[PDB]
Amino acid sequence: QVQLVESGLRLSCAASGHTFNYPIMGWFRQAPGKEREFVGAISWSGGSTSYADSVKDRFTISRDNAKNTVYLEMNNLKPEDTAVYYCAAKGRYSGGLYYPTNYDYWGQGTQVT
Amino acid sequence: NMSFVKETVDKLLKGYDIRLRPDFGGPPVCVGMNIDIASIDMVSEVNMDYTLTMYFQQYWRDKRLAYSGIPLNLTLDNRVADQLWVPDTYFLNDKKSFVHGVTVKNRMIRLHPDGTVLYGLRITTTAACMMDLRRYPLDEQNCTLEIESYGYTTDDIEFYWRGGDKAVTGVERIELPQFSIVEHRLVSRNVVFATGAYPRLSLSFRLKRNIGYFILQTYMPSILITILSWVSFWINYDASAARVALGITTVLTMTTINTHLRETLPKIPYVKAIDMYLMGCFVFVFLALLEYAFVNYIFFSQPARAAAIDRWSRIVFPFTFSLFNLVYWLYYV
Amino acid sequence: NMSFVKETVDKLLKGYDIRLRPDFGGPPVCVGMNIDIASIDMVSEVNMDYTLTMYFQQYWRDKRLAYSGIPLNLTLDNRVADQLWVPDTYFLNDKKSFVHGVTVKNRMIRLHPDGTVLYGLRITTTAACMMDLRRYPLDEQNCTLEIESYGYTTDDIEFYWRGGDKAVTGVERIELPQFSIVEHRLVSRNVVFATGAYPRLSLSFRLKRNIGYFILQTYMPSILITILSWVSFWINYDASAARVALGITTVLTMTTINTHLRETLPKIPYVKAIDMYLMGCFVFVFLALLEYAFVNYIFFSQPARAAAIDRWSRIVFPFTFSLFNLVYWLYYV
Amino acid sequence: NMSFVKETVDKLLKGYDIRLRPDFGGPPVCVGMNIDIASIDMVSEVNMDYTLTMYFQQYWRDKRLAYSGIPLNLTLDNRVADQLWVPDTYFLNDKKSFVHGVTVKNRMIRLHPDGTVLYGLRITTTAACMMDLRRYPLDEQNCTLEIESYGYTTDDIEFYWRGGDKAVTGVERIELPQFSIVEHRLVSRNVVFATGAYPRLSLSFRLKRNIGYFILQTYMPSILITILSWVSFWINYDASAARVALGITTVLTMTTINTHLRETLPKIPYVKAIDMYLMGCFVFVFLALLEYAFVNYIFFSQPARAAAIDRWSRIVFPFTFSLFNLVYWLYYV
Amino acid sequence: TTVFTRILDRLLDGYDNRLRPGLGERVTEVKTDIFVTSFGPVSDHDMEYTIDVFFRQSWKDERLKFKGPMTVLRLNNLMASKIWTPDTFFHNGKKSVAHNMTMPNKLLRITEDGTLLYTMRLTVRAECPMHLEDFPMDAHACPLKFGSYAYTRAEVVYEWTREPARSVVVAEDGSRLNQYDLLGQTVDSGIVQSSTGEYVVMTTHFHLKRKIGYFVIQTYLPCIMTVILSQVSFWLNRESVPARTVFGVTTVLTMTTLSISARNSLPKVAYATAMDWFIAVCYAFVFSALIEFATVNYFTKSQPARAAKIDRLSRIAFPLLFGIFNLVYWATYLNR
Amino acid sequence: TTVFTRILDRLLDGYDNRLRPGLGERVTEVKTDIFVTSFGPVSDHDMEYTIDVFFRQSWKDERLKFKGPMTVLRLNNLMASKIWTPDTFFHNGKKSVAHNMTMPNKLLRITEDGTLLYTMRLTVRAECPMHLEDFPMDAHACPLKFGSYAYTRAEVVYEWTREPARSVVVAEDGSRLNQYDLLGQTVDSGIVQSSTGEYVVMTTHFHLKRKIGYFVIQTYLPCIMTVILSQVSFWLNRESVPARTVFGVTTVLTMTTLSISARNSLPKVAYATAMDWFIAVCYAFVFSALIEFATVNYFTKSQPARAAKIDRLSRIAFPLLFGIFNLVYWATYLNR
Ligand SMILES: *[C@@H]1O[C@H](CO)[C@@H](O[C@@H]2O[C@H](CO)[C@@H](O[C@@H]3O[C@H](CO[C@H]4O[C@H](CO)[C@@H](O)[C@H](O)[C@@H]4O)[C@@H](O)[C@H](O[C@H]4O[C@H](CO)[C@@H](O)[C@H](O)[C@@H]4O)[C@@H]3O)[C@H](O)[C@H]2NC(C)=O)[C@H](O)[C@H]1NC(C)=O
Ligand SMILES: *[C@@H]1O[C@H](CO)[C@@H](O[C@@H]2O[C@H](CO)[C@@H](O[C@@H]3O[C@H](CO[C@H]4O[C@H](CO)[C@@H](O)[C@H](O)[C@@H]4O)[C@@H](O)[C@H](O[C@H]4O[C@H](CO)[C@@H](O)[C@H](O)[C@@H]4O)[C@@H]3O)[C@H](O)[C@H]2NC(C)=O)[C@H](O)[C@H]1NC(C)=O
Ligand SMILES: *[C@@H]1O[C@H](CO)[C@@H](O[C@@H]2O[C@H](CO)[C@@H](O[C@@H]3O[C@H](CO[C@H]4O[C@H](CO)[C@@H](O)[C@H](O)[C@@H]4O)[C@@H](O)[C@H](O[C@H]4O[C@H](CO)[C@@H](O)[C@H](O)[C@@H]4O)[C@@H]3O)[C@H](O)[C@H]2NC(C)=O)[C@H](O)[C@H]1NC(C)=O
Ligand SMILES: *[C@@H]1O[C@H](CO)[C@@H](O[C@@H]2O[C@H](CO)[C@@H](O[C@@H]3O[C@H](CO[C@H]4O[C@H](CO)[C@@H](O)[C@H](O)[C@@H]4O)[C@@H](O)[C@H](O[C@H]4O[C@H](CO)[C@@H](O)[C@H](O)[C@@H]4O)[C@@H]3O)[C@H](O)[C@H]2NC(C)=O)[C@H](O)[C@H]1NC(C)=O
Ligand SMILES: CCCCCCCCCC
Ligand SMILES: CCCCCCCCCC
């Protein structure tokens, strides 16, 4: 069991518990009129990152294992980026990375405008 | 009459197309599975995998293989499976697996009057298991086994555990030389890829390592040598030969433990819990010899101060080593 | 109706010739490729190769397989691939590879009405990787994977990544306990051999070794023992038994580290950056023992000169060791 | 003319029955065998087997394949062997064997005008060889290779070495890194099993281990250290620090040799001729240290008797160590 | 010559190899016996052993009756694959080999009454679980189970050709063991029940006993002589502080070398074997000897009478306690 | 489209693949060339090496003449099994691999006149008999022999496609050697006669040379500095009996540690390599130093003048003899 905490424009996601069984953290935003959209993902250990096409070079994701925190650095913000931001955890063999269903533990909704 | 049975089976295989799944273009075919764990051969931290031997059974219904007039379950030869349709089940996290073939290929086909098929296999697989060796040798592992279809999405095939939580058997009889199985779970879910959504079945074990052995072999010799280095504080500081020989031989003995246990310990390079303890004991034997240098330098001109330092070293070193153990065990246990 | 679908599939393969490439005699066939990496099992410096498991999808078009009247994508059995034309793709730098075959062969064929063929494989390969271990353990490797067509030339077949930079997925799944994935690139080019020219695709990663393990096991024990050999300069020179025993045991301890380290690290038969550091420390402990021998030889007739050498040794030896580390670390970092 | 040759070969295989031996129902078919040894790769004491590579040719006469009008020995393709009758020869004491298949299967078929058939194979086999290692490393092994038919008796088939003692060639070109072939023999006999009699052919070698490696690495270091233990007898008995350090370090050095020696040598868990010498030398250094303790205990009260023990120890220890060697070498050579 | 050709082609006419003999009418009975050519090496690390056998099976098939000049027909391997054969497999096998050099090592003989005789040459690697709590003074019973994989006890049953004791034969030269002694074997049969039905299982246990000669010379004797060596330090005069201090620490270093090397011999387990208890106790005696000298050296000057008394008693207590420990240790395991 | 289908179906009509081209009329000539993609690792313990090649072969077949719109038929690898191909094998190969990923790595091209081009990708392990007397300053010539297996020189002969030196090509990146330097290669052909006949054999030798820089910093330098260190004992005053005795014994233990470690790197052999003769001499110099002090310590009290004389000459004799030995040792092997 993994607990996710949302804090933070520099959003931070904090995790505790069996964080080793869920080594991938992802960020999703939910439009008021549309469905959840992938933003980015970060490996807990390797540090390799993947980003959505619309947010490349504008958002940066990094993590530290000192306190189990994942950072979402938001730059060049635009008015169309108004959505509820979620932090999620994905299993090691959960399949695709851009699909919300594969993620098990979802953090509390956070609103940034 | 076996001639009547021969005609019935030959009629089933006449015009039978193995390229088309049952109910092609219709509802997905439900496939039930259950596993009998024969043994768990070896768990390797170096290669991050374990070996599993099991009896893998699959259950599904094919109306194209329905026969009448024979009130028997036809247990046909295992070579007839090559002329039927079977699910394309593969283990998603295996490094190498095979089906035993002595004396014949270990395979089972058992038809049923209503068209049901039982398909058994005997497989030895080497599944991958990533491990968290930060707390080694006081670590706890969770090795899984993922079962998934390779070509058919959830629109064509479905998976479920036959018998609920009683699908997997034989786990309670498994004995591992270095681990101890605590719990096993069965998970059913769907996995979404770019191509589509695939059914998923998951079997996982929680492995807890046995710590009692490592106390005698690894922790005990290091503690005794550290205590043995404190004997120098109870020898008069004028005996330079006695204290230096004792101080430097324990350092040599501490390096012998470090450079010979790592050969026994797994060769997976990164910091473990045991490494921090051996390096921690290495500092205490290093500081014990470094303490005498301070005393031997000032004992000729300040005999009172030199005696006082030895008196305090008889207390600080045993006390500080107890604090080091107390912090170490609490942080790792 | 399953009977109708069987007629269509039989019609497509009736008269089909697998010996002729699609669009024979015309424009080259474009074969888009994408890779889904499962894991990198191990990286070996002794054999200079890495083991890779991946999903290898190929995507081309053949007008001969076009069908009408069936508004579905035919996901046929994996045994139908033997009756179709497939590209002769091979990996140039692979040493030993296979297709997983439990429970069935991990292969996929998925046809489309316009004639598009999707052909996926699950392959475990051991590709060769040249390594430059001069800076070991502070090295940074770059392993590749070459994809090429064995028979056809650029006029017959063409290779391209399907999706641009999105062709390769699953890089974040790579969890090497010793290395860290830093970057990966996709390259498309052409290669000319003595028998003609061929298209080329390249997938390359960049690896950076983790230095945390080598600090605890290799660098720290050598530094402490080198420091421990400076205690000799703080002991009165008339204590011959104490200074000789301390001096010669550190030399013995230093050889124990060096000799028992080559038996655990991978056997790389040329000079690396970890051998220079150990040999540098072995000189310092060797010189510290020579310093006392000169002192022991002149202290009877020249007590002042012998005492002067001891005082300067307490400064020069720690100072010149700092320069050795400062030059070493800056050069290799 | 290839048209005429094609007709002849098609006629020979027309109506040929693969289930009938030549001269079926009559005199037994004489199968002549000769072997060309290519190499002996590795002789393993741990697994008790050796690896052999050879060209295995079989000779027999079949009247059904006799052809006339073609004054040539027809060397057919290696795949025509599947359509002819071949003896069911197997190796009784082989553990893992295979036929080389690069670039094609290493097989030969050559017919003769009078019906003689030549059948050659290139086989790499691992054959079990029971070893008596009580005299290691001065032993002398005898490894064999048993050739027998599987389902025929002396009434149906017969084996002989085609060429007498010249049947096996290439033995003199073998260069074993550790052994030295002395002699080989060829034996023909009959064996009675539970299911009946069987013809038998036996090829046996004789290997003599080279002692040059063990003299420098094992025997010489143990002799020199044992001699160093006798240095303590020539030091005045009042120097307790010198004699104890010399005596106890030789015990530690001897222990270091044995522990490191049994890691490199093959794991053979029973007493060998090399374990007696190492344990024999370990006692001598143990007694030299124990001798001084008696001298140190009485030198204060009986100065005359303590010096006498030292003088006799200068003769008894060197003399007794010669008797140990003389008994040891004669008993094993 | 031509007569046998017609008989072979006639037998396979109207024959279905997918159906066992007497399907739906009776139970197929298979008589089995094994001839062990060589009982191969036993691996403690993997808990497995290797065996090479001549596996024989025999059963009646009414559909293969024939009449001709000869009573026994020796078929070919191509002919063998055309008829029904039992699907015998080894329950505890790991990866077996059916030899194929230079031909498939199989035979199939048919009698005129329909009796069949199947024989093949195999090499079976099987699991042998071990309890090494008495290492190296332990004994084991490695089993070898086999039976049918698809046919339950209501269809196919297995029997031994003769009495079970004499149905498994080991060759006189068949012993490829380095550290074990093959005492004998016991043969029996039973019933195994699984999720797919009840099956007949044939069992044979090979009893082994480890040879202790190697471990006495390599491990026990060096440890005993080292413990004796440390107690020799009690007989040196107390004035020789450098001599006794160097004596104590080097023996501790000697024990560490012996302790490290000994553990490498044992397979990687996670419980205390009989070897570990002996080493740990020997580790305490050497450690306690150096601690005793520290007490003696502390009272050498202030209370010389007490220092002599402590050193005098240690020359008796230490040899007595170690001698008592050996008496208990060797009586517990050798007589077990 | 269909035109090429008819041509391919016509070629195999009335074609016999059991007979070599020109059987009974001429000698089949095969032109061979090799492109070594990567000269793989060399194993000293097994005396072998791995090599990846692009084996090409070409021969004339009159039976495969055709006339059509094109001149070259770049057929699939499935076609090669329908026609005669040379049975080339490697004489000294141990276990080779013909890759089949993702398809068989073979190509067959048929020119109109009948010329056939046959190419395949292989991974060959070959024997390299090594004379390790000069280890680690030795050189080797690892061969690679191939030829026909069943056809004698009167039936099939082998030739290089171009000049023999240029018929074998090594890629610039093709060198996976860690401890060797591929100096060059020589190519030649000859005749080998065996028990069955005379065969044409094509040979190529790869000349290697071991790197010495690792052994200098790993074995020679620690051993040289240890011998020098033991000779420093001659300068300590003779009255420090405990100091010089500990100095001598610990250097002997130091040599044992270095000697044991060095032997592990050396491959299992029987003779005495050049590495062993250097360690053995270094072992005697350290041994003789401790013996020298024993003689000096014997005359310290009775004849102090003689003891000083022995200690004075040993300060020159030992450094001089060891320096002379290094001069002889390094001149013997570095110039050979
Ligand atoms: C080793 O580590 C692995 C993970 O790497 C662990 O596996 C996890 O196990 C837990 C259970 O212990 C799994 O959680 C369960 O998943 C079920 C499946 O969910 C799918 O289906 C539902 C709809 O039915 C979807 O909503 C969902 O998105 C999935 O598609 C759920 O049905 C379970 O829910 C049940 O329990 C919860 C409370 O836990 C209730 O609230 C529910 O109402 C319901 O009763 C549950 O959530 C988890 O999915 C597994 N992870 C993976 C990646 O497979 C192993 O357990 C661990 N080893 C050991 C020994 O513990
Ligand atoms: C591990 O190491 C390998 C090398 O061993 C690295 O691989 C190299 O990667 C670079 C890119 O980073 C490659 O360079 C690129 O080659 C492309 C193909 O060139 C072919 O086609 C052009 C014509 O289009 C011909 O001129 C040429 O001869 C080739 O036939 C180019 O298209 C690329 O162009 C890029 O640079 C130019 C400027 O130079 C720009 O104008 C372009 O817009 C574009 O940005 C580029 O030159 C190189 O070829 C690779 N090596 C090999 C051997 O193929 C790996 O990158 C490294 N690993 C990691 C992780 O970095
Ligand atoms: C390694 O170890 C094996 C044994 O494990 C040795 O093999 C033995 O080799 C000897 C020869 O050195 C063999 O002895 C010979 O056997 C021949 C065959 O005997 C069979 O046939 C005869 C009838 O012809 C029967 O009587 C007999 O029972 C057997 O069925 C004999 O023909 C030989 O006869 C020789 O001696 C007689 C006198 O006794 C003379 O009259 C003959 O002229 C002739 O000189 C001989 O007896 C023995 O059989 C082999 N044993 C096995 C088990 O194979 C290897 O030799 C050894 N390795 C080396 C290098 O020596
Ligand atoms: C490239 O090279 C590889 C080898 O490196 C080839 O792989 C082999 O392919 C053949 C042909 O498909 C395989 O042979 C088949 O074996 C099946 C049984 O395999 C099991 O049992 C064997 C031992 O007997 C094990 O080694 C194996 O792991 C399995 O456990 C048979 O059932 C097959 O029979 C079918 O085909 C034959 C063809 O004559 C028919 O007669 C039968 O009726 C039936 O339809 C077949 O014999 C072989 O097993 C593969 N090797 C391995 C190691 O598995 C590739 O095929 C080759 N590439 C191409 C394109 O051919
Ligand atoms: C570990 C050091 C043990 C020292 C013992 C001193 C005993 C003193 C008794 C008064
Ligand atoms: C075995 C070594 C003996 C050394 C003796 C040194 C003194 C000799 C005096 C004649």
mmCIF file of N, CA and C and ligand atoms in Angstrom, chain B residues 82 98-101 105 107, chain C residues 82 105, chain E residues 95, chain F residues 77 97-104, ligand 4:
data_model
loop_
_atom_site.group_PDB
_atom_site.id
_atom_site.type_symbol
_atom_site.label_atom_id
_atom_site.label_comp_id
_atom_site.label_asym_id
_atom_site.label_seq_id
_atom_site.Cartn_x
_atom_site.Cartn_y
_atom_site.Cartn_z
ATOM 1 N N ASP B 82 -1.919 -30.278 -31.378
ATOM 2 C CA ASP B 82 -1.421 -29.529 -32.523
ATOM 3 C C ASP B 82 -2.480 -29.319 -33.593
ATOM 4 N N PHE B 98 10.491 -23.495 -20.543
ATOM 5 C CA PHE B 98 10.373 -24.619 -21.460
ATOM 6 C C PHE B 98 9.353 -25.604 -20.910
ATOM 7 N N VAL B 99 8.903 -26.500 -21.783
ATOM 8 C CA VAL B 99 7.976 -27.567 -21.427
ATOM 9 C C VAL B 99 8.745 -28.879 -21.428
ATOM 10 N N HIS B 100 8.618 -29.639 -20.344
ATOM 11 C CA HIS B 100 9.356 -30.888 -20.214
ATOM 12 C C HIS B 100 8.901 -31.889 -21.267
ATOM 13 N N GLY B 101 9.848 -32.669 -21.782
ATOM 14 C CA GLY B 101 9.553 -33.587 -22.864
ATOM 15 C C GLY B 101 10.121 -34.982 -22.698
ATOM 16 N N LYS B 105 6.359 -35.417 -24.521
ATOM 17 C CA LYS B 105 6.101 -34.033 -24.156
ATOM 18 C C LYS B 105 5.027 -33.972 -23.078
ATOM 19 N N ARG B 107 2.196 -32.895 -21.773
ATOM 20 C CA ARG B 107 1.032 -32.149 -22.217
ATOM 21 C C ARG B 107 -0.195 -33.032 -22.053
ATOM 22 N N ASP C 82 3.855 -18.432 -40.996
ATOM 23 C CA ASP C 82 4.687 -19.263 -41.856
ATOM 24 C C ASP C 82 4.198 -19.293 -43.297
ATOM 25 N N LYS C 105 4.560 -20.016 -29.343
ATOM 26 C CA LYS C 105 5.570 -19.083 -29.818
ATOM 27 C C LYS C 105 5.020 -17.663 -29.760
ATOM 28 N N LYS E 95 15.364 -31.458 -15.633
ATOM 29 C CA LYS E 95 15.571 -31.364 -17.075
ATOM 30 C C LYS E 95 16.261 -32.653 -17.518
ATOM 31 N N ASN F 77 15.813 -17.353 -48.611
ATOM 32 C CA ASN F 77 16.637 -18.421 -48.052
ATOM 33 C C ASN F 77 15.941 -19.775 -48.078
ATOM 34 N N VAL F 97 27.434 -21.444 -34.671
ATOM 35 C CA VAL F 97 26.025 -21.070 -34.672
ATOM 36 C C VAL F 97 25.704 -20.400 -35.998
ATOM 37 N N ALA F 98 24.610 -20.822 -36.624
ATOM 38 C CA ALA F 98 24.054 -20.155 -37.794
ATOM 39 C C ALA F 98 22.803 -19.418 -37.338
ATOM 40 N N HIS F 99 22.866 -18.089 -37.338
ATOM 41 C CA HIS F 99 21.815 -17.287 -36.729
ATOM 42 C C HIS F 99 20.506 -17.410 -37.500
ATOM 43 N N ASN F 100 19.397 -17.400 -36.762
ATOM 44 C CA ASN F 100 18.050 -17.523 -37.311
ATOM 45 C C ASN F 100 17.128 -16.478 -36.698
ATOM 46 N N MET F 101 17.592 -15.231 -36.651
ATOM 47 C CA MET F 101 16.822 -14.135 -36.074
ATOM 48 C C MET F 101 16.933 -12.925 -36.987
ATOM 49 N N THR F 102 15.796 -12.420 -37.463
ATOM 50 C CA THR F 102 14.488 -12.997 -37.176
ATOM 51 C C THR F 102 14.143 -14.062 -38.208
ATOM 52 N N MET F 103 14.986 -14.159 -39.226
ATOM 53 C CA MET F 103 14.882 -15.136 -40.294
ATOM 54 C C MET F 103 16.265 -15.724 -40.513
ATOM 55 N N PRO F 104 16.359 -16.891 -41.149
ATOM 56 C CA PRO F 104 17.680 -17.459 -41.439
ATOM 57 C C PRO F 104 18.550 -16.475 -42.205
HETATM 58 C C1 LIG G 4 16.191 -21.416 -37.214
HETATM 59 O O1 LIG G 4 16.870 -22.339 -36.360
HETATM 60 C C2 LIG G 4 16.095 -22.759 -35.227
HETATM 61 C C3 LIG G 4 16.993 -23.644 -34.391
HETATM 62 O O2 LIG G 4 18.145 -22.942 -33.946
HETATM 63 C C4 LIG G 4 14.836 -23.473 -35.708
HETATM 64 O O3 LIG G 4 14.053 -23.854 -34.581
HETATM 65 C C5 LIG G 4 13.675 -25.237 -34.728
HETATM 66 O O4 LIG G 4 12.565 -25.368 -35.619
HETATM 67 C C6 LIG G 4 12.156 -26.729 -35.829
HETATM 68 C C7 LIG G 4 11.063 -26.697 -36.873
HETATM 69 O O5 LIG G 4 9.956 -25.917 -36.442
HETATM 70 C C8 LIG G 4 11.705 -27.335 -34.503
HETATM 71 O O6 LIG G 4 11.342 -28.696 -34.707
HETATM 72 C C9 LIG G 4 10.021 -28.911 -34.171
HETATM 73 O O7 LIG G 4 10.078 -29.505 -32.872
HETATM 74 C C10 LIG G 4 8.785 -29.718 -32.284
HETATM 75 C C11 LIG G 4 9.025 -30.250 -30.889
HETATM 76 O O8 LIG G 4 9.879 -29.393 -30.145
HETATM 77 C C12 LIG G 4 9.872 -29.813 -28.765
HETATM 78 O O9 LIG G 4 10.694 -30.967 -28.567
HETATM 79 C C13 LIG G 4 12.068 -30.767 -28.937
HETATM 80 C C14 LIG G 4 12.763 -32.098 -28.760
HETATM 81 O O10 LIG G 4 12.159 -33.109 -29.555
HETATM 82 C C15 LIG G 4 12.677 -29.659 -28.082
HETATM 83 O O11 LIG G 4 14.020 -29.428 -28.498
HETATM 84 C C16 LIG G 4 11.857 -28.385 -28.226
HETATM 85 O O12 LIG G 4 12.365 -27.377 -27.359
HETATM 86 C C17 LIG G 4 10.392 -28.660 -27.912
HETATM 87 O O13 LIG G 4 10.237 -28.977 -26.532
HETATM 88 C C18 LIG G 4 7.972 -30.674 -33.153
HETATM 89 O O14 LIG G 4 6.669 -30.821 -32.597
HETATM 90 C C19 LIG G 4 7.877 -30.136 -34.574
HETATM 91 O O15 LIG G 4 7.221 -31.085 -35.408
HETATM 92 C C20 LIG G 4 6.411 -30.389 -36.377
HETATM 93 O O16 LIG G 4 7.143 -30.140 -37.578
HETATM 94 C C21 LIG G 4 7.651 -31.334 -38.196
HETATM 95 C C22 LIG G 4 8.481 -30.892 -39.380
HETATM 96 O O17 LIG G 4 9.044 -32.003 -40.062
HETATM 97 C C23 LIG G 4 6.490 -32.244 -38.589
HETATM 98 O O18 LIG G 4 7.006 -33.452 -39.136
HETATM 99 C C24 LIG G 4 5.630 -32.546 -37.368
HETATM 100 O O19 LIG G 4 4.488 -33.306 -37.751
HETATM 101 C C25 LIG G 4 5.195 -31.255 -36.689
HETATM 102 O O20 LIG G 4 4.300 -30.536 -37.530
HETATM 103 C C26 LIG G 4 9.265 -29.834 -35.123
HETATM 104 O O21 LIG G 4 9.997 -31.042 -35.297
HETATM 105 C C27 LIG G 4 12.831 -27.240 -33.483
HETATM 106 O O22 LIG G 4 12.384 -27.710 -32.215
HETATM 107 C C28 LIG G 4 13.297 -25.792 -33.355
HETATM 108 N N1 LIG G 4 14.416 -25.693 -32.432
HETATM 109 C C29 LIG G 4 14.263 -25.532 -31.114
HETATM 110 C C30 LIG G 4 15.527 -25.451 -30.309
HETATM 111 O O23 LIG G 4 13.154 -25.454 -30.592
HETATM 112 C C31 LIG G 4 14.039 -22.552 -36.620
HETATM 113 O O24 LIG G 4 12.910 -23.242 -37.147
HETATM 114 C C32 LIG G 4 14.923 -22.065 -37.766
HETATM 115 N N2 LIG G 4 14.195 -21.139 -38.618
HETATM 116 C C33 LIG G 4 13.335 -21.537 -39.563
HETATM 117 C C34 LIG G 4 12.670 -20.445 -40.350
HETATM 118 O O25 LIG G 4 13.102 -22.724 -39.773
#
